[model samples]
Target: GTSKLKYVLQDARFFLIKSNNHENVSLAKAKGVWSTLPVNEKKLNLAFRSARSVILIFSVRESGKFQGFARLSSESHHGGSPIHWVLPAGMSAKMLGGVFKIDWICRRELPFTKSAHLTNPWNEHKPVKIGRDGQEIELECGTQLCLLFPPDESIDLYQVIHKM
Candidate 1:
């Protein structure tokens, strides 16, 4: 199921939008996941600058195993409002790659964990990101779809579509 292969987009409560650009916030959720702590902005910028489309890879493997996934938005959405998504306890993921929005999400998991490691589609192996690329990571018609802000020690996380 190709369609099934595509991760599902859920709705979100209050989401953030870029102060300069107000684009739609698209969200995806996962359960029983975790992200690397002590995340830095320089690394994130470097990653986004050199990514085709960021993806949050979510894994449902055993505990202590990083089971998360991600996807790059179709161009940088100025204001990517958070939508709906679900995740079970003891799970986590970081903002692999995305643009910065002005609007902030204020839900259960509204604020993001200040320290979470980010990775490219291939997971944390390669350099994660680069300054644009020749093919897949190349810019699309002068359209930039990655966040343009330094990593802040203040990240936010929110929740939606609660499940039991």
Candidate 2:
């Protein structure tokens, strides 16, 4: 038999919702600094890989806050590294699910807590603007979900990887 592992927050489950392609301003605000920002991206991705499974939650609005979840799965054999994926904003999980590379995932929210938890407010929240007509991608980091920023009077964007 295989040994079982446990996480503080029950493994967060993910729900793949379709992007409505809403024109949001938050996307513009987050652009260059949010997903694409090399620093933030690296920081976010690293945190995700540390989790059991990554719950992916997203929305497609021009300027406002949308939600989604990424639940981490169990450990790999030989205690191998975790397999993760980068969910594109505005792009439905179903669309990117293929390219996401990391397969083991759940489409439903975890039972007890809020898997929709997001990245730091300074780096995560806010609407994502989709000016482009065709298709767009919105990606999020797990750890940044809870960040407190007081320097710029803005919130910090960094969250620790944990289950709900």
Candidate 3:
């Protein structure tokens, strides 16, 4: 398969959407996959400023490999909810409920190791988080997608890997 999709790295910033199994996520290579993650105003802004070219790379939750990347759409959706994206057509069950919908998936196993690094997607440094769905409180749209936030101590692992 052609790896030109990876070339989008230079023009777009990528956020790693998590999965427990990289192999499972790779299954979407044949069809298409869609998924979502928490994002605040900043990420949304990044989405807009990037000229409709943000990318979401799929990473094994606790493992250390990035298995796929897809074009991220900035379709307006609420983040305070339990999320809004579902896996592609082949995702056994629970495949319909989230945002940042993606259609095509490119499985190009990229290596990553959070252990020898210091970026944790769940580590939010800002305030105000309206859990999965306790009170259905929709707050402002400035929440940050922690995979690339906390300004002082944050940067994607790929940036360090490649000399761009």
Whole-model lDDT, candidate 2? 0.28
TM-score of each: 0.23, 0.26, 0.42
Candidate 2 weakest ten by summed lDDT = 146-155
Question: Listing every candidate in turn, what is its Cα RMSD in Å to the true structure after a full C-alpha superposition?
Answer: 16.4, 14.6, 11.6
Model 1, position 98: C-alpha lDDT score = 38
Error of 2 at 130 (Å): 17
- Pick the lDDT winner: 3
lDDT of 1 by residue, 1-97 (tens): 2221111222111111111111111233221211222232333334445543233322222222212223322233323444323323443423423
Which ten residues in a row are the worst by lDDT in model 1? 12-21
Q: State the lDDT of candidate 2 residue by residue for 80-153, as single tens digits.
A: 23222233455443332111212212122221123234322332343222222211222232322211111121
Compose the digit string of candidate 3's lDDT tens values, residues 12-95: 544545664545465544334443333433453456464435555556655555455555544434443443234345643333
Better of 1 and 2 by TM-score: 2
In candidate 2, position 20 carries an lDDT of 42
Off by over 4 Å in 3: 1-7, 22-24, 27-30, 37-50, 73-99, 103-105, 113-164
Please give the TM-score that candidate 3 achieves against the real structure: 0.42
